[PDB]
Each structure stands twice: as C-alpha cells, then as structure tokens.
Design an enzyme around this catalytic site. Structure first.
Site, PDB file in Angstrom:
ATOM      1  N   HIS A   1    -129.258  95.016 137.726  1.00  0.00           N
ATOM      2  CA  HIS A   1    -130.313  94.264 138.013  1.00  0.00           C
ATOM      3  C   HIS A   1    -130.933  95.937 138.567  1.00  0.00           C
ATOM      4  O   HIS A   1    -130.604  97.216 138.789  1.00  0.00           O
ATOM      5  CB  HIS A   1    -129.515  93.600 138.971  1.00  0.00           C
ATOM      6  CG  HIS A   1    -129.457  91.852 138.743  1.00  0.00           C
ATOM      7  ND1 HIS A   1    -129.234  90.545 139.596  1.00  0.00           N
ATOM      8  CD2 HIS A   1    -129.518  91.438 137.166  1.00  0.00           C
ATOM      9  CE1 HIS A   1    -128.232  89.798 138.374  1.00  0.00           C
ATOM     10  NE2 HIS A   1    -129.210  90.537 137.687  1.00  0.00           N
TER      11      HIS A   1
ATOM     12  N   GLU B   1    -130.222  96.558 141.743  1.00  0.00           N
ATOM     13  CA  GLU B   1    -129.025  97.669 142.811  1.00  0.00           C
ATOM     14  C   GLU B   1    -128.418  98.352 142.078  1.00  0.00           C
ATOM     15  O   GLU B   1    -127.921  98.807 142.228  1.00  0.00           O
ATOM     16  CB  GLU B   1    -128.929  96.280 143.277  1.00  0.00           C
ATOM     17  CG  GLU B   1    -129.507  95.423 144.588  1.00  0.00           C
ATOM     18  CD  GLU B   1    -130.117  94.452 144.159  1.00  0.00           C
ATOM     19  OE1 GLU B   1    -130.791  93.296 145.059  1.00  0.00           O
ATOM     20  OE2 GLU B   1    -130.619  94.581 143.028  1.00  0.00           O
TER      21      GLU B   1
ATOM     22  N   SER C   1    -133.592  90.350 147.905  1.00  0.00           N
ATOM     23  CA  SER C   1    -132.030  89.130 148.399  1.00  0.00           C
ATOM     24  C   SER C   1    -131.257  89.400 147.708  1.00  0.00           C
ATOM     25  O   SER C   1    -131.548  88.778 146.097  1.00  0.00           O
ATOM     26  CB  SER C   1    -132.266  88.840 149.476  1.00  0.00           C
ATOM     27  OG  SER C   1    -130.769  88.589 150.079  1.00  0.00           O
TER      28      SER C   1
ATOM     29  N   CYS D   1    -128.103  89.438 144.526  1.00  0.00           N
ATOM     30  CA  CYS D   1    -127.561  88.192 143.850  1.00  0.00           C
ATOM     31  C   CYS D   1    -126.059  88.240 144.421  1.00  0.00           C
ATOM     32  O   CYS D   1    -125.093  89.696 144.754  1.00  0.00           O
ATOM     33  CB  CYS D   1    -127.349  87.815 142.758  1.00  0.00           C
ATOM     34  SG  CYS D   1    -126.437  89.976 141.610  1.00  0.00           S
TER      35      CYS D   1
ATOM     36  N   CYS E   1    -124.719  91.813 143.002  1.00  0.00           N
ATOM     37  CA  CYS E   1    -125.362  93.460 143.724  1.00  0.00           C
ATOM     38  C   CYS E   1    -124.775  93.719 144.879  1.00  0.00           C
ATOM     39  O   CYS E   1    -124.028  93.999 145.717  1.00  0.00           O
ATOM     40  CB  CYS E   1    -127.056  93.042 143.615  1.00  0.00           C
ATOM     41  SG  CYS E   1    -127.756  92.805 142.148  1.00  0.00           S
TER      42      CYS E   1
ATOM     43  N   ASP F   1    -132.575  86.493 134.763  1.00  0.00           N
ATOM     44  CA  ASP F   1    -131.795  87.156 135.707  1.00  0.00           C
ATOM     45  C   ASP F   1    -131.032  86.138 135.761  1.00  0.00           C
ATOM     46  O   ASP F   1    -129.764  87.744 136.254  1.00  0.00           O
ATOM     47  CB  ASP F   1    -132.660  88.297 135.922  1.00  0.00           C
ATOM     48  CG  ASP F   1    -132.764  89.126 136.258  1.00  0.00           C
ATOM     49  OD1 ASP F   1    -132.348  90.307 136.104  1.00  0.00           O
ATOM     50  OD2 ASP F   1    -132.935  89.879 137.412  1.00  0.00           O
TER      51      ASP F   1
HETATM   52 ZN   LIG Z   1    -128.402  91.510 141.149  1.00  0.00          ZN
HETATM   53 ZN   LIG Z   2    -130.548  90.726 142.444  1.00  0.00          ZN
END
Ligand SMILES: [Zn+2]
Ligand SMILES: [Zn+2]
Ligand SMILES: [Ca+2]
Ligand SMILES: [Zn+2]
Ligand SMILES: [Zn+2]
Lengths: 156, 161
Positions: free
Chosen positions: B65, B67, B92, B94, B97, B158
C-alpha cells in the site's frame, strides 16, 4: 473452526516452520508462515522474513507470506488461515485484519508478543497458539546470537 | 473509539511532506496504479528518509500500500530513527498501514484526507498514543475520488473486498 483444530492446522504450522528454517539458513530472521484455504487445504502462499535477504523493512514473515500469494479477490481471504511461527506484531496483525483472514495459528508467543494478538480477538478473529517448541527454540537461538538484528526487525 | 480525544498542532515540515505524498500519488496514478502516496520525514532536521506510492498494480503486490511502500523505500533503519519521524499519507490508513506506524513507533501521521476512506485505524492510532493530523487536502480528495469513481473494483481489491 473454533475449539477443535482445523484438519489443515498441522500442515500449516509445519510449512511455516519449514519457511523459518529456510530463512535461518539464508542468514535471515527465522520467522515463517503460509496461507491455507480452509475449504480444501490448498496452499495459497508461503514465505519468511526477508529483511536481510532483500534489505526490506516491511517483509516480515507474515507480510512476505501474503506477498507471495499474489493479488487475490477479497473474498478468497475470507475462508483462509494464516500460519505464523511467531505471534504477529502490530503491522502483521493489521494485515490479517485488513484482509479479513478469519484464523491465525501461531507457533509461539514466548519469544515475542505484541498487543496485536489480543487485538485480533477484539476484531473478531480466532487466534490459536500452538506453543511449538521447534519454533521457539529456533527463534531463541537467533535472538541469542544476533539480538540487535532481532531488535531491528521490530523497530527496537 | 474515545469521545475525549485530541488531534495535533502543526509541524514546519508538514507542508513539504504532504506535497511529496501528493506527488507520489500523482506518480502512481500516471503509472496506472492506486493514487495513494506518502513519505517519511525526520522531524529532527526535515530530511526525507523515503517516499513511495501504492504498487499493487505496478508489482502485482498485495502488501505494498502507499504507506508500506514508503517505509520499504526508506530501506533498513535503526529502530530509534523512526521514533522521531512523521509519516505522510494522502489517505487515512487501513488497519495494516496503521499497524506499521504502530509497530515502528512513528509518533506522527499526517493524513491528506479521510473523506474517501477511513478505517478503524485512524482512531486506533490515537488510542495507541499516536498523533494524527488530517489536513483535508483538496488535491488528494479530488484525485482519490476520481480513481474510486473510475475503478471501483480495483479500489475494493486494494482493501480486500
Ligand atoms: Zn493500508
Ligand atoms: Zn491505504
Ligand atoms: Ca464510475
Ligand atoms: Zn513478526
Ligand atoms: Zn510483523
């Protein structure tokens, strides 16, 4: 499954331990795992920590395992079990939660345990700690000989 | 999920950090990937330790991802280095992350926006003691909104849906 072990739990932990051993041989952190489909026992992926092998700050055994499964539809994860030789850190716990992997079978949580083990349960996941001495002994040996390398893997 | 929580003040490098993150997101978009970017800055001197964007489509990655890719791009670092940094992300984080920020002990997370997406992670970060600053960057919101509009099925993949 809940309560009674899954028919694939021994297979999954043995593969995870196999991966940890492989990683140890490559001179890396001995943490391994695999993702198994609860329906037929098929192995979607398997892997181990790649911090030293590829200078990776994110490829913990669990993350490497998921990375090796490749891109999958979200629904596939919903009926799988993630096997890891060591109780997941907050990041790997977050990965299990994000993908909705219902079960996480852990080899041991003696050498390491984060707030993630309980957070998984809070988030509705089933956690099974086997307390596999083979995993515990292998991880302890690495910590004994390369404490600083272990610390780096968990940002300590 | 506390009712008596707090956010953040303002760092001198936040403007720079979100600019880099946005640039990373645009880069990802150009490459045909998920437009989420970020960077990690050393609060001590404003040095950019690394930057990156989502690589799901670029590398067939289930874990990269925005991050995560950012952290990967900083390379291996001494644990103490992360303790005085700020992770910038255009969206923001998940649960995964969020977990990464928590694991490495990155004290601050500056978020572009949480209108197109917000997980239990934003709150959990604060519960775990991390400082979260949502800037509501319009550049980021427009880009992500368009991506979600155009590729709903890719957005869901994702986030494991
Ligand atoms: Zn994430
Ligand atoms: Zn994300
Ligand atoms: Ca549309
Ligand atoms: Zn771990
Ligand atoms: Zn981990």
């Amino acid at each position: 499954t809940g309560g009674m072990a899954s028919k694939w739990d021994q297979k999954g932990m043995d593969i995870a331990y196999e991966e940890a051993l492989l990683g140890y041989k490559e001179g890396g952190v001995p943490i391994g795992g695999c993702l198994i489909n609860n329906k037929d026992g098929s192995v979607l992926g398997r892997g181990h920590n790649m911090r030293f092998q590829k200078g990776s700050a994110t490829l913990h055994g669990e993350i490497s395992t998921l990375e090796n499964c490749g891109r999958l539809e979200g629904k596939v994860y919903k009926d799988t079990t993630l096997y890891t030789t060591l109780s997941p850190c907050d990041m790997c716990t977050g990965a299990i939660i994000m993908y909705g992997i219902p079960r996480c079978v852990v080899g041991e949580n003696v050498n390491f345990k984060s707030k993630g083990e309980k957070y998984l349960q809070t988030r509705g996941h089933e956690v099974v700690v086997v307390d596999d001495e083979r995993c515990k002994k292998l991880m302890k040996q690495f910590i004994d000989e390369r404490p600083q390398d272990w610390f780096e893997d968990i940002g300590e």
